[PDB]
């Protein structure tokens, strides 16, 4: 019921930032879509834009706990790899959202 | 006592095991598939211990070192490369990648491609967590369904497996196949996960592979038919 | 016609169209008939001077590839009377120097070497991808000349009937500018070291596979800048039986070697503005049976 | 039937091996420090590049 509530609530928020954003702002749209748990229309957007890798990522957002084990070890690896300095924290905050890491 | 009828009343694994029990044709199809892939796994054996000597765990090491030297030296390079490690960083960016990178990639693609044409899934996550494609291992999970039965005892794990967005997610893969532009391995694996005949044509050419694919496609189409039923 | 003198010019399988490439920056094409000929085209595109092209086998149809100084290889396919630019590759640091088609028995793959010190081999599905087979440190300095495996040659195939199809192992040869020649076989998905050859203490210029139809043996005419022309021959590489013989001691920097389309004789470009026509006589020795003053 | 004192040691070994196989980096998809060894020595190889 809480989820259906948020579905009702975030309608106008989506309608406002949708004019704001675009495939330029697509990771910001990712953040919004994650905040909504609005995987359906997120995927529909990603496909109408042909965003296959991102669409595949979308299903993984609420996968099994093994998904998060994957992300923990994978990001520990990227830490040992220093790649963040070469990768925008934008996709990285997407990654934190997927991994359940708030900070 | 063949064949049954019911209505959704509990977790979809009820649907699943009903479907498995009810029909014959799919049953012998399942058995002949078990045959062929038992053949496959007998061929496999200890590929685990044998990959002990295939290993590299540096992500796009050549691009790594060359962008490092561009940032690091008096002289950079005149050569275009991704700024991103993304599994779709190049093709999304259209940017090139290095041959040694992509070809050790293709090598591991043989490894796991074969492992999953056999379905050797334990070794599959093994190789994923070797080479750091935990992203790809995640991508592996888009089809395996969802359940839980913790209607009992304390808060205890009966099943937490995946995202129930899978019917539509296979539909998405279906349309990705209609979009094409893939490597052989990804093309084959996901045209497989879709049972897409034309994009499954390229890789299976053996007698065993073609009969195998016949069974795979027909088992899928059937199984989804009585899913929706 | 062409603004610069011609390096290479090749007729078709059927004798009815001629492609002619110079370093004059474009390549011109005549239809061929009755002794008459109309320049049907002059293909542009090559932002480096052009040396070589490469026709493909007839059961595939009509296919041409070309190298230039700009490190660009342009790829041309003929339609409705129109040859046109179908695939083009670059990514190279030094001018792409050697391109040569493989036997149709192996398929539609071109070999592409440059003096980069390393070489790629590119497959065209004929409608699809251009499969890349790039080998680095192929030379410590650079690649000069390369030859394929011709697909079928005697030596063990007398007992192999015509109805069946034999295993097609991929091999080839080449020589570079590190003063060395080398021989390659394909396996594990890649190519490894058949042979290292160090006899010309100077750079090798051109290499000639004797089309060994009727030959169990393996025969090479290697021409270098050092004026030494080596017939390298092995009856068996597994017993390691490659041996050098002198073919001729020309005192010029020895330049080019190309076997006949009839696969009978060899044409050798010398530092004399001449092309010596050599034939291995019926007996045991290599006789310059004729000449063409270039 | 008999030999339960030995079955005790058997299950002790079974659980020690269960530790050794589920944790301690050994078999069934454990992160083997050998591949990190690889990573570091390839770093060194990149150093001498």
Curated annotation (Swiss-Prot), chain D:
Superkingdom of origin organism: Eukaryota
Localization annotation: Nucleus membrane; Nucleus, Nuclear pore complex
Family assignment from sequence similarity: Belongs to the nucleoporin interacting component (NIC) family.
Function summary: Plays a role in the nuclear pore complex (NPC) assembly and/or maintenance.
Name under which the protein is recorded: Nuclear pore complex protein Nup93
Organism encoding this protein: Xenopus laevis
Lineage: Eukaryota, Metazoa, Chordata, Craniata, Vertebrata
Residue numbers of the full-length protein present here: 1 to 49 of 820
């Amino acid at each position: 019921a809480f989820s259906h509530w948020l579905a009702q609530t975030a309608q106008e928020r989506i309608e406002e930032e949708v004019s704001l954003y675009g495939p330029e702002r697509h990771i910001e749209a990712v953040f919004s879509y994650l905040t909504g748990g609005r995987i359906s229309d997120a995927c529909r957007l990603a496909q109408k834009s042909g965003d296959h890798r991102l669409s595949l990522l979308l299903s993984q957002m609420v996968g099994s706990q093994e998904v998060r084990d994957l992300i923990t070890l994978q990001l520990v690896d990227w830490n040992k790899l220093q790649v963040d300095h070469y990768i925008q924290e934008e996709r990285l905050r997407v990654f934190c959202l997927l991994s359940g890491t708030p900070v | 006592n063949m064949f049954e009828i019911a209505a959704p009343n509990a977790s979809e694994k009820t649907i699943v095991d009903k479907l498995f029990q009810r029909d014959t044709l799919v049953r012998q199809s399942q058995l002949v598939v078990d045959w062929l892939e038992s053949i496959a796994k007998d061929e496999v054996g200890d590929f685990s211990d044998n990959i002990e000597y295939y290993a590299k765990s540096v992500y796009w090491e050549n691009t790594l070192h060359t962008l490092k030297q561009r940032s690091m030296l008096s002289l950079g390079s005149s050569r275009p490369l991704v700024s991103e490690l993304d599994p779709d960083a190049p093709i999304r960016q259209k940017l090139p990648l290095d041959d040694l990178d992509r070809e050790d990639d293709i090598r591991l693609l043989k490894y796991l491609f074969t492992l999953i044409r056999a379905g050797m899934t334990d070794e599959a996550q093994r190789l994923c967590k070797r080479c750091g494609q935990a992203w790809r291992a995640a991508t592996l999970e888009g089809w395996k369904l969802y359940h839980d039965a913790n209607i009992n005892g304390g808060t205890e794990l009966q099943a937490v497996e995946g995202n129930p967005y899978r019917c539509v997610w296979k539909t998405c893969c279906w349309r990705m196949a209609e979009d094409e532009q893939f490597n052989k391995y990804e093309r084959a694996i996901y045209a497989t996960l879709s049972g897409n005949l034309k994009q499954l044509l390229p890789v299976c050419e053996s007698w065993e592979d073609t009969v195998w694919a016949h069974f795979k496609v027909m088992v899928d189409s059937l199984v989804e038919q009585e899913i929706r039923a | 016609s062409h603004e610069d003198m011609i390096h290479d010019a090749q007729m078709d399988y059927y004798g009815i169209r001629l492609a002619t490439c110079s370093s004059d920056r474009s390549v011109k094409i005549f239809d061929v008939k009755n002794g008459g000929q109309i320049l049907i085209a002059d293909l542009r595109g090559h932002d480096g001077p052009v040396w070589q092209v490469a026709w493909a086998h007839p059961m595939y149809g009509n296919i041409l590839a070309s190298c230039s100084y700009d490190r660009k290889v342009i790829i041309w396919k003929e339609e409705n009377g129109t040859w046109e630019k179908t695939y083009e590759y670059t990514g190279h640091d030094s001018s792409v120097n050697s391109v040569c088609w493989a036997p149709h028995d192996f398929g539609l793959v071109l070999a592409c070497g440059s003096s980069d010190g390393a070489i790629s081999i590119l497959t065209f599905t004929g409608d699809g991808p251009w499969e890349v087979k790039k080998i680095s440190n192929a030379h410590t300095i650079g690649c000069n000349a390369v030859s394929w495996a011709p697909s079928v040659i005697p030596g063990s195939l007398v007992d192999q009937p015509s109805s069946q199809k034999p295993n097609y192992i991929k091999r080839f040869v080449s020589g570079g500018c590190d003063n060395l020649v080398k021989i390659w076989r394909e396996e594990d998905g890649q190519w490894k070291e058949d042979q290292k050859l160090e006899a010309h203490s100077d750079w090798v210029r051109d290499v000639a596979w004797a089309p060994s139809i009727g030959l169990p043996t393996s025969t090479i005419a290697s021409c270098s800048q050092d004026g030494r022309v080596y017939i390298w021959t092995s009856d068996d590489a597994a017993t390691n039986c490659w041996t050098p013989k002198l073919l001729h001691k020309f005192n010029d920097v020895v330049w080019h070697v190309s076997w006949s389309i009839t696969a009978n004789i060899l044409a050798v470009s010398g530092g004399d503005n001449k092309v010596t026509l050599w034939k291995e006589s019926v007996d045991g020795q290599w006789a310059c049976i004729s000449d063409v003053n270039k | 039937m008999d030999g339960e004192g030995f079955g005790e040691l058997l299950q002790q070994a079974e659980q020690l091996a269960a530790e050794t196989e589920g944790v301690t980096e050994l078999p069934h998809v454990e992160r083997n420090l050998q591949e990190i060894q690889q990573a570091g020595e390839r770093l060194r190889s990149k150093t001498m590049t």
